[PDB]
């Protein structure tokens, strides 16, 4: 019924870090179209005093993934990580940018 508040399209990596650092909550995130790899997508998340970047990988079947679990759409990848840690290093759960 309403558009997703996490799609920022084509913004530079540095721009995403800029906006996210201003966020008050860990897990604040946005999906941006990648700069190192055009056509691809990147996930930027605020965590502590930093902004971490995750590359959205793709396979031959068009599925999206960050680690091992594969998703059929960015939408599902995003929702899954609202309850499950987006990272295997630290426990980080996606929260909408405010």
């Amino acid at each position: 019924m309403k558009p997703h508040p996490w799609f920022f399209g084509k913004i530079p990596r540095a721009k995403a870090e800029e906006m996210l650092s201003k966020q008050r909550h860990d897990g604040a995130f946005l999906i941006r179209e990648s700069e190192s790899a055009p056509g691809d997508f990147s996930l930027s998340v605020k965590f502590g005093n930093d902004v971490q970047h995750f590359k959205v990988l793709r396979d031959g079947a068009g599925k999206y993934f960050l680690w091992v679990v594969k998703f059929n759409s960015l939408n599902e990848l995003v929702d899954y990580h609202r309850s499950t840690s987006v990272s295997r290093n630290q426990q980080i759960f996606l929260r909408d940018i405010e």
């Binding site: 971490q52 970047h53 590359k55 680690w67 990272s87």
Partner: peptide, 6 residues
């Protein structure tokens, strides 16, 4: 470089 792909 990314968290999931150093």
């Amino acid at each position: 470089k990314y968290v999931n792909v150093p």
